[PDB]
Design a protein around this nucleic acid. Structure first.
Ligand SMILES: [Mg+2]
Lengths: 41, 313, 132, 52
RNA sequence: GAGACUCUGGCAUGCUAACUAGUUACGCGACCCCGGUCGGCGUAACUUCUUAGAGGGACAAGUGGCGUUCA
């Protein structure tokens, strides 16, 4: 019987499956157009 | 009314030159790393027979040599490696006196005080460690830190202004006050990651290069950006000459020394014999450092080769 | 033989396709990128990912790939299509026309046209492809 | 000794004369003695199939 | 399923460290011609060696042809 993965680690490993690559979608990144300042501190 | 020229070359590497470190006290002495684990300690004869001869070899790094730096005094040099740590090499006997262990991640920057007394070391873990010469981490910031990464930090040669600039892979040229020890200014506007930052001999303007392949000038008379001259190809290293009002810049295959009086490129000096002109990479320039007077420039390249570029006139 | 698995390859295409800019050609640097941005449990997995991610970045830096829709390519297509020459090729000062289209237009309403030329008949009957 | 406590040109000249004579001096012999394995009378053989 | 994984080998003069591990500095003693030798004796720190936990470490990294210059 193949047991399910669980971060709890009671029944199995903390580790994700070594094959299973849960790949997340990249965040919306803004390229800064002008050099500018907000000088403080 | 002057032009650079290849005075000589230091042929002594198997892998390519990750970083080369210079010192103003001894002009005929350069300490150069490679992809292999060594750091070759050259002796620059500059004679008819050979330009340089390997004097010592600072063997110690477990794996590939990332960064190496020499102090302004020149008898010692601290190097950093993928072990995480750095090693204070005694450059005469060519061996470590004191090893700086402490950094959690790759040490991408290290900086002496103007006194060459205090040491500060920056790594990709959101920390800035600060030490004395006796070698104790007096304080580091871990919880109170950046959301992103701090790839490099450097010092201002001017002693009266205790200021350090820091580039990174977040594309932000940060500026910190050593007195306040909190950032003076961030500078959003830069697309692409920054490689190197350097300050001018006068201490008025300072160049900055990065992924853009652009020499973005910040002002030291007033902490303000002024204007940018395009290095073009990835700027792997930059360095100001002390005697001249020059900006040396590693721009891809060749070196570029711009003038600030008239904002215009003068010339790019590429060797004609380029071998990889057939579905091959050309030799991209990775590092540079001016000599004490600024008449010789040591430049380390991706073709496992350190060319020196003397000013003729 | 050092060949990439589908878990290796798909990961490299996802890495270059999502963060082409962060990535580069050299393994050991863009490795630092891959370990930071992506949490790879094994060092072997990390390093393999990085080495195929590097060589692939050089492939794209060399040129455009066939079976993938890059957003940059979408922008250049919008740019190229908006490329317009000075004049259209269709605008012509004189248009050649055959005698059948002359006869057919003359029977139709559109008899006289200013810029037409009922050209000569194609003499020399050799149009069929040889047999055998 | 010459690379460490004196100048390195001696290390390269010695090392190069060595490279120009013979590469085994530098390329290590990784070779080591292989163990006999269960399932046979010898080292590689798996057990003797015996007709008859 | 292969691969992946786990363990082992290896790069770590780096982190953490040890009179049930030793160490480097010397000196003595018998003899041989000042020293050399000795599991004969003494001077402390440390972990280079030793032992083993945590981390870290190399990846087709370089090039040529060939190939959608892709794999
Ligand atoms: Mg398998």
């Amino acid at each position: 019987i193949m047991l399910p993965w669980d971060p709890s680690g009671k029944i199995g490993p903390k580790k994700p499956l070594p094959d299973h690559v849960s790949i997340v979608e990249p965040k919306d990144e803004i390229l800064p157009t002008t050099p500018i300042s907000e000088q403080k501190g | 009314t002057e032009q650079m020229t290849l005075r000589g070359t230091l042929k002594g590497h198997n892998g390519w030159v990750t970083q080369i470190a210079t010192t103003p006290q001894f002009p005929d002495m350069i300490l150069s790393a490679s992809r292999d684990k060594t750091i070759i300690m050259w002796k620059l004869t500059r004679d008819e027979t050979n330009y340089g001869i390997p004097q010592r070899a600072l063997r110690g790094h477990s794996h590939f040599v990332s960064d190496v730096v020499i102090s302004s005094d020149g008898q010692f040099a601290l190097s950093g490696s993928w072990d995480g740590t750095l090693r204070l090499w005694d450059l005469t006997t060519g061996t470590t006196t004191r090893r700086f262990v402490g950094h959690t991640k790759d040490v991408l920057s290290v900086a002496f005080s103007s006194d060459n007394r205090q040491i500060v070391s920056g790594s990709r873990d959101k920390t800035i460690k600060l030490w004395n010469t006796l070698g104790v981490c007096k304080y580091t910031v871990q919880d109170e830190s950046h959301s992103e990464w701090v790839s490099c930090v450097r010092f201002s040669p001017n002693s009266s202004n205790p200021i350090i600039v820091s580039c990174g892979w977040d594309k932000l040229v940060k500026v910190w006050n050593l007195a306040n020890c909190k950032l003076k200014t961030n500078h959003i506007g830069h697309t692409g990651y920054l490689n190197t930052v350097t300050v001018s001999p006068d201490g008025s303007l300072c160049a900055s290069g990065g992924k853009d392949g652009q020499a973005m000038l910040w002002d030291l008379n007033e902490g303000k950006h002024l204007y940018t001259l395009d290095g073009g190809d990835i700027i792997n290293a930059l360095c100001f000459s002390p005697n001249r009002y020059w900006l040396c810049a590693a721009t891809g295959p060749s070196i570029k020394i711009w003038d600030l009086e008239g904002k215009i490129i003068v010339d790019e000096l590429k060797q004609e014999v380029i071998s990889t002109s057939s579905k091959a990479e050309p030799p991209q320039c990775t590092s540079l450092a001016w000599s004490a007077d600024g008449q010789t420039l040591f430049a380390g390249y991706t073709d496992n080769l350190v060319r020196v570029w003397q000013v003729t006139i | 033989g050092r060949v990439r698995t589908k878990t290796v390859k798909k990961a490299a295409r996802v890495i270059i396709e999502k963060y082409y800019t962060r990535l580069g050609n050299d393994f050991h640097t863009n490795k630092r990128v891959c370990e930071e941005i992506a949490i790879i449990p094994s060092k072997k997995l990390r390093n393999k990912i990085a080495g195929y991610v590097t060589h692939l970045m050089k492939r794209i830096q060399r040129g455009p790939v066939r079976g993938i829709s890059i957003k940059l390519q979408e922008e250049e297509r919008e740019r190229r299509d908006n490329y317009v020459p000075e004049v259209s090729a269709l605008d012509q000062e004189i248009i050649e026309v055959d005698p059948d289209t002359k006869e057919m237009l003359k029977l139709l309403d559109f008899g006289s046209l200013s810029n037409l030329q009922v050209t000569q008949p194609t003499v020399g009957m050799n149009f069929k492809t040889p047999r055998g | 000794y010459y690379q460490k406590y004196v100048d390195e040109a001696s290390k390269k000249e010695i090392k190069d004369i060595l490279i120009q004579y013979d590469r085994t001096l530098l390329v290590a012999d990784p070779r080591r003695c292989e163990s006999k394995k269960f399932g046979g009378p010898g080292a590689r053989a798996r057990y003797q199939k015996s007709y008859r």
